[PDB]
Amino acid sequence: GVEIETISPGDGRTFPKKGQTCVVHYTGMLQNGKKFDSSRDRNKPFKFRIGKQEVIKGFEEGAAQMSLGQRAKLTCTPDVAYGATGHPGVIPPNATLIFDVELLNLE
Amino acid sequence: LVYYEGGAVCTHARSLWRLEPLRISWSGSHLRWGQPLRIRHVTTGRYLALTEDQGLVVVDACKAHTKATSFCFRVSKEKLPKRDVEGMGPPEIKYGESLCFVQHVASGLWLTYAAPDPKALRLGVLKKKAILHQEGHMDDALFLTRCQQEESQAARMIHSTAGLYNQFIKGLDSFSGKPRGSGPPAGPALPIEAVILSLQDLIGYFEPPSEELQHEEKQSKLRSLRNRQSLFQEEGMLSLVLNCIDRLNVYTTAAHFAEYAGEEAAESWKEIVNLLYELLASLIRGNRANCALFSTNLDWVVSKLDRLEASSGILEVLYCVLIESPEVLNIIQENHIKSIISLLDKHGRNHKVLDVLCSLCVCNGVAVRSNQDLITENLLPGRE
Amino acid sequence: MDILELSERLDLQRFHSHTLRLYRAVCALGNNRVAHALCSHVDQAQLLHALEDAHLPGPLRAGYYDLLISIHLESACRSRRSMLSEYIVPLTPETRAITLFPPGRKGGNARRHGLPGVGVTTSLRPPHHFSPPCFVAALPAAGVAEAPARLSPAIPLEALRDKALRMLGEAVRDGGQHARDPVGGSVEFQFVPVLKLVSTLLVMGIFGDEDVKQILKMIEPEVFTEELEEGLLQMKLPESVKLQMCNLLEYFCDQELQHRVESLAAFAERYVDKLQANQRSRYALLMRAFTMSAAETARRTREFRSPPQEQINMLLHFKDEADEEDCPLPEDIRQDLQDFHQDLLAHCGIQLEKKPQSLQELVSHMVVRWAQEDYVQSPELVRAMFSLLHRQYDGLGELLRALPRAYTISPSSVEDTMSLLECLGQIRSLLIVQMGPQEENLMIQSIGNIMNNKVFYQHPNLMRALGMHETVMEVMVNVLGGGETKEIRFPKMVTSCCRFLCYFCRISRQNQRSMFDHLSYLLENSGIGLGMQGSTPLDVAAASVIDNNELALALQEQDLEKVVSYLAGCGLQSCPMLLAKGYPDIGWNPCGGERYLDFLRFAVFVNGESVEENANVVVRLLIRKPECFGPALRGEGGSGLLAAIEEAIRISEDPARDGPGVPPEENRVHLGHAIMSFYAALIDLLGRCAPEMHLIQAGKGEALRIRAILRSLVPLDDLVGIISLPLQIPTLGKDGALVQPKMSASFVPDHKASMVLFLDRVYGIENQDFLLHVLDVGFLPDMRAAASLDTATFSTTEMALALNRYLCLAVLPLITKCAP
Amino acid sequence: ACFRMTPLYNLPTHRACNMFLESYKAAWILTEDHSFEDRMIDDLSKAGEQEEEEEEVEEKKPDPLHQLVLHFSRTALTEKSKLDEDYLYMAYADIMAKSCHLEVEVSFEEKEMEKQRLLYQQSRLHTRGAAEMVLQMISACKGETGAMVSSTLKLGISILNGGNAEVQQKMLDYLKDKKEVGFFQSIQALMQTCSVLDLNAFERQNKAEGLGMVNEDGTVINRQNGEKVMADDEFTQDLFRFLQLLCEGHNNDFQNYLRTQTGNTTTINIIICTVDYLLRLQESISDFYWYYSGKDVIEEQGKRNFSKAMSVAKQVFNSLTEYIQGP
């Protein structure tokens, strides 16, 4: 269960395929509206190796749908997120997450 | 039962005897060998005696008929009361020298450690019971050593204080049930004014020294404070006050106390529970030993953290325990962490709670990652 | 609201400044797992902006700098800081290039001192490890206490060190103007938090050679010239800032000491090569000396017949010029050594004006000036400055105390050394944290990595200089202290430390000798661990004195006093750990008694020959405390040793008394086997306490008296009866099922081997009739029993192997002795 | 082995360098002499360029040496169960002790010069609280033998050489007004922990040298490691030398103080405890005689044992002389 709303469309023809890493600037927020994670504060692109499941499932399968240069808003359910165990001291248990993902480039 | 006990036992208050002669006037005259005098244990208020059914014991002052309780000090063991002198007397017995033999004057017997030693004393410490032997052994001579005025005064304070709180306790549980309604109280009136005054006296007795004092004077006052606190705990005053909080805590509000003891006792309920918490904090503040005593019943203080009549007092008690004893920290569980955090949620933004939380992570430069994980698990992710 | 509003809303300022303290409390002392979590609450941008915010209040500014240090820098700084006390110098060409003084033209005896901390250092320090924070990464499938150890959160250090340098430069120039609005509210709040960050970056080695030059210029601009801008030593600082300044000078003094050590190691590298070459050439010349010399060649070949350590000692033994004759070195080599000695003393300021001209005169002058300017109040400040002053005056003393931790290694072993230092840093990091399951698996694999490391065997001296055994000892002792009465939590780690310590003892005698000094330390902590099975803290003591003469002789009497008192308690009280598991109660602890006995067995028997002094002390203690022998051998109300054996044999073969009966626990205690094995150990200890035969032949009084005591304590007939006792032999049958007994709960051959030894050493065999009488009842059934077992089926069984060892090591050599 | 074993030039470079390092430090660094104590205390005893305002306040500002002594007195007066080892206090105490003594018919007038210089050199320290500091560290050590208490005793002797009257008066004043029993309790415990001659230890030493074992990294022949009989003989010597210097010069005021403490709550007889140690020493010597009664010649180690045992007996007898002279 994931919902993706476009904030600003990008290309729409180059989609993230297996073999090339995906380079993003995301901004994760809790459902109450309290930001918990971002990449622009660290001021470094978050390059994650798509297909190897090293990131959370919701982010992984929501990044596939959106294309290059697209600012997209996600909504990851706890099932596709950390769930009942949650993240210790960061994310409360059984929480729905929202991500302001932007894939500025594929490598 | 009297013993020739050893070790650190007779740096406490239980080994202090007061030489009480048979003469009122000139009762502090210089001791002369072989003159009658009683023996009194200051902290218990009992006199050395030769009873018929248990030999050499300590008897209450109500039944010291001066025959079984008189004693004499003698330089040698040969068989020997003189005429009183209206003056300072002749200086005969010295402190730290002049080996004395204590002989009961009415019976002629001699004090001696008991020879038999059972299975308990086979491995345990030899608590040699004192028996007033008919002739006595050879090395049973005694030195006499003075105790400082601080210790003697303190010792008398426990003996008076114990009686005043034991009497308070008995009055308290006398009306444990039996709702008064609209009539008179259950029995004798509670010594409320006496207890309140005694608490305010002990709180000032145990007040921590000021920071402006010079380091040399300050440390000596620390020694005086630690010694007095340890003497009180070792004599059981700390347990007695713990019972006092236990008895008082069963009633939720002052009106609820009024329904069981009277309307006149309702006004002093809040004051007398605050004073008890302040006394407990002063009795335990800075002592590793006294703070360690809460490691067994740590839930007793944590469970009271939600009471509103005295919230700062119990919080101060908890803070004093945690800042001093690391062994208390290892007893801390998720129940306690979720209880302390609830105080932040219920009693407002009290920074002293954050001080308690800070003290729960590191104690004496050693981290406790179990407590660190529980705190960051329960406090941080909620963001509320 | 704006965070700058807290400069007036003091009600919330206290709460927030304490909140930051709580943040440093949770992530304190290397809790990098929590430190990653805090990066979500306070971001890197938030931190950097709060670094730059000049209008932030005092407590919040200092709290935010300390929070940045706590989250990102303290774990790496601490781990590095521990490693700054050791100097492991590899032999590399860059190490060779290191010299005491820079190449210049000031003076031959001493050029100008190089800039402290500026140059190249070849000492080994493991690199830092950081993990960038990513909160969207998938949860690891590894469970708690099994996942790899978390690293500290990352942060750009090139930018952080540039911001820090710029910030301190601004503060230095701001202080000269003496404005009425210092940053943060006060001079202390402006300079102390920044200097903490600068000190941390120096310790972590972040700053380069140029950056250190900048810091030296900003501290004192004219002293540190290489060839309002007022230096930090002339701005009338308060006491709190001076403490950080003393920490700065402490770091530079440490850098100077490391420079001296590295220079000395470089000169060692060059001088050994020239000494080896000269001593080889002189050896070759000595091989041709037989054609023109005489009987005085013994002196010149004394060196080559003497082990190398004193060869260097006599080679270098020409300092005072009164003994040059014994030294065979040529004058050019001797001059070279005394040249390096002269500038070494000049560098250390021994012997070769408002200008200090270097660090050593600078520090001493400013420390004295600080002390005489005002009555210094802070005790830590006073201690720091007088430690700096003591180092500068006793410049050579700190070096002399620094050489024992110095060491040189081959250039081909650095990559192994790095892994060793990393594991040692992991162990050192556990000295400040309460032990838990997570740290338990961290150090079991850290120790295993040390065992897997070849340097741990190649250089036992280096492990002793690093104090690896000391740290493992303190880690073990802390856990033994935890739950010292109820039960010792985490037994798996304790038996791994004790296993490591035993393997440390077996490497060399010096490792064993160093381990011996903590014998009393081990003994008083070994009173409870015997319930734990495997390698106990007592086993460390046993391997600490195993098979060594001078150590066994040096073993103090009071250590045996502690052991016998522990044994008496074992023989006098029941084991509470055994009680709680539903075991039937007996008034003494056999397993604990046995574990003390086998240690005494190791103490009184070295290399097959009894140690007479320890044997006599042990038997005198045992006779003085009869409860050490147990319920039997007590005299009044006690049965005989034999009656205790058939009683134990019946208990062993009869369940519902051998144990709870409800190995089944895979370490199950059996009271039947425990009692017999305790008495076997007691007898074997007395047997090895018996005097050697040559003392009896010499007719020594004490030897006769002691053997008379052992004869009185243990009568001969009961010994022969126990040797004569039958043994449960495995039986063949039930369609080929080789049924075997439970040797963990039954009579074993080793109990007989313990009885045979005592008979051999105390009573012996003198006459034929008694010899045959011992045979036909005690030995002859045993040889026929093993005769039957030796076949195609039972030979490989456990009982058969036990009988083989029992005969070939206890009975058959005795028969060979008594052949005539 | 020695005829055929490896020569020096065939060792690995790193191992050979390690041997060179330990040989160099033992032969050229330990042997080196560096007298810096005089120029340390000289700098620390100057309070300069602070008299421009010429203020009249009694305390002014303590000079750096006084501040250092105050700091060590503070860390000795603090309440702690056990006295931890301060390596810097050990170094500064050794520096202070070495900065006083600094040490064929000398004329009586020039004889008076070195003494009257020594009194000044002691007066540079004892006017700054070092006399009270020594008493505090002795009381603080609680009777635990170590190099911590040893360096305090050495400093006390260094400021008490020649029986300084001012130092003995200041020390007596401090004990009499403080009225604490920790000082004599620690002194009594220290004296009761002093060792005597041990035959069992000696026989173990003899058999240990009978083995003559050798190490691996080269070889040490007849190693001179710590003797296990009268190891603390030097500490017992300067403990009694400190006690003797306290009573030296016929200080009848302090001689009575050792015998009995008027102000204190508990009285400890140092004279009796000194006798009891003397008995333990002579018992050791008497039991050492009977071991050599059968033998005719006394070997070298037995000589060195008698030399140190008798030097300790000398210091005890001199102290017992000083306790009663005057009379």
Side-chain angles (χ1 to χ4, degrees), chain B residues 56-121:
Chain B
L56 199 57
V57 298
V58 294
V59 73
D60 293 331
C62 296
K63 295 176 272 298
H65 48 284
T66 317
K67 158 157 166 57
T69 44
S70 186
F71 281 89
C72 294
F73 278 45
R74 202 159 293 102
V75 54
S76 178
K77 300 190 87 168
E78 192 275 332
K79 300 289 94 175
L80 274 301
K82 276 75 57 187
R83 285 277 65 69
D84 70 316
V85 58
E86 292 303 303
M88 207 48 250
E92 301 190 18
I93 313 190
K94 309 192 50 144
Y95 268 115
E97 293 94 342
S98 70
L99 290 79
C100 305
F101 294 100
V102 173
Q103 173 167 43
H104 196 310
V105 65
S107 295
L109 312 193
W110 303 73
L111 78 167
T112 297
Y113 41 91
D117 305 297
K119 168 193 169 195
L121 308 184

Side-chain angles (χ1 to χ4, degrees), chain A residues 39-95:
Chain A
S39 309
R40 286 171 175 82
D41 302 77
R42 311 189 256 115
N43 199 10
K44 174 191 178 74
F46 165 55
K47 310 176 184 180
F48 77 112
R49 172 64 267 175
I50 185 169
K52 274 74 185 180
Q53 286 69 231
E54 82 279 11
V55 298
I56 193 62
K57 176 190 313 304
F59 198 101
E60 170 93 358
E61 58 90 13
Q65 322 181 35
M66 51 146 288
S67 68
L68 179 67
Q70 184 178 2
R71 293 177 59 187
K73 179 261 193 173
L74 277 74
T75 305
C76 298
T77 195
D79 297 280
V80 309
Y82 296 114
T85 187
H87 201 278
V90 179
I91 285 166
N94 290 311

Side-chain angles (χ1 to χ4, degrees), chain C residues 407 455-465 504 507-508 510-511:
Chain C
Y407 198 88
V455 188
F456 175 59
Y457 307 95
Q458 288 184 342
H459 307 93
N461 293 329
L462 185 61
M463 310 314 89
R464 216 178 322 115
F504 188 77
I507 297 305
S508 68
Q510 306 88 327
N511 281 350

Side-chain angles (χ1 to χ4, degrees), chain A residues 30 34-36 89-92, chain B residues 376-378 380-384:
Chain A
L30 281 174
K34 300 168 178 328
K35 173 177 75 63
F36 82 102
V90 179
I91 285 166
Chain B
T376 180
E377 173 174 309
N378 294 300
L380 297 188
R383 305 183 154 80
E384 71 194 278

Side-chain angles (χ1 to χ4, degrees), chain B residues 254-295:
Chain B
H256 189 258
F257 185 66
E259 294 160 36
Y260 287 68
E263 285 90 344
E264 76 276 15
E267 292 90 3
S268 305
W269 178 77
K270 179 159 157 155
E271 181 185 4
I272 200 167
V273 68
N274 289 116
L275 293 174
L276 283 156
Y277 285 141
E278 305 188 10
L279 176 66
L280 182 52
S282 282
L283 282 171
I284 71 177
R285 175 179 286 117
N287 284 312
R288 178 69 181 276
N290 300 349
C291 279
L293 295 205
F294 282 70
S295 83

Side-chain angles (χ1 to χ4, degrees), chain C residues 91 264-265 267-269 271-273 275-276 279-280 283 304-313 315-316 318-319 337-338 340-341 344-345 349-350 368 371-376 379-380 382-383 386-387 389-390 393-394 396 399-400 403-404 406-410 459 461 508-510 513 549-550 552-556 613-614 617, chain D residues 2-3 5-34 36 39-40 43-44 46-50 60-65 67-68 70-72 74-75 85-88 91-92 95 200 203-204 207-208 211 213-221 225 228:
Chain C
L91 300 183
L264 179 52
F267 173 76
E269 162 59 29
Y271 190 80
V272 169
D273 292 334
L275 183 63
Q276 278 186 334
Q279 182 251 335
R280 180 193 301 266
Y283 179 77
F304 314 99
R305 211 155 39 252
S306 48
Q309 173 56 241
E310 62 266 32
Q311 300 188 24
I312 301 106
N313 286 119
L315 274 165
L316 299 183
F318 63 101
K319 175 193 172 185
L337 174 60
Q338 294 167 342
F340 181 82
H341 192 74
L344 173 62
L345 302 184
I350 296 300
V368 169
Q372 64 195 6
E373 269 185 358
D374 50 329
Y375 184 19
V376 189
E380 298 91 9
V382 173
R383 181 177 188 89
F386 275 115
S387 302
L389 184 65
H390 166 244
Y393 269 77
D394 191 14
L396 189 59
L399 174 61
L400 176 58
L403 275 296
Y407 198 88
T408 62
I409 63 174
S410 172
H459 307 93
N461 293 329
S508 68
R509 286 191 306 274
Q510 306 88 327
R513 153 160 278 281
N549 280 313
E550 57 268 15
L553 279 172
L555 201 158
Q556 305 270 316
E613 289 80 4
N614 297 338
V617 165
Chain D
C2 287
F3 278 79
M5 61 76 87
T6 302
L8 176 57
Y9 53 76
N10 285 336
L11 272 299
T13 313
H14 66 269
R15 284 190 57 183
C17 284
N18 285 330
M19 320 284 188
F20 171 75
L21 288 180
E22 58 191 1
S23 176
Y24 181 74
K25 54 168 295 184
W28 292 73
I29 303 184
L30 283 168
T31 66
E32 197 71 24
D33 193 304
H34 183 48
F36 67 100
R39 70 189 180 102
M40 184 182 288
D43 301 3
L44 295 179
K46 302 180 186 305
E49 274 75 36
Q50 271 67 240
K60 317 158 308 310
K61 303 182 298 324
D63 56 356
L65 186 66
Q67 282 171 16
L68 170 70
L70 287 184
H71 174 272
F72 285 143
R74 164 191 179 93
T75 192
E85 282 79 3
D86 303 298
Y87 64 93
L88 73 164
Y92 269 110
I95 277 162
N200 304 334
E203 290 165 347
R204 297 165 177 273
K207 298 200 61 57
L211 276 296
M213 294 299 291
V214 297
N215 51 21
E216 293 84 348
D217 45 349
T219 294
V220 57
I221 307 173
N225 48 3
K228 278 77 185 171

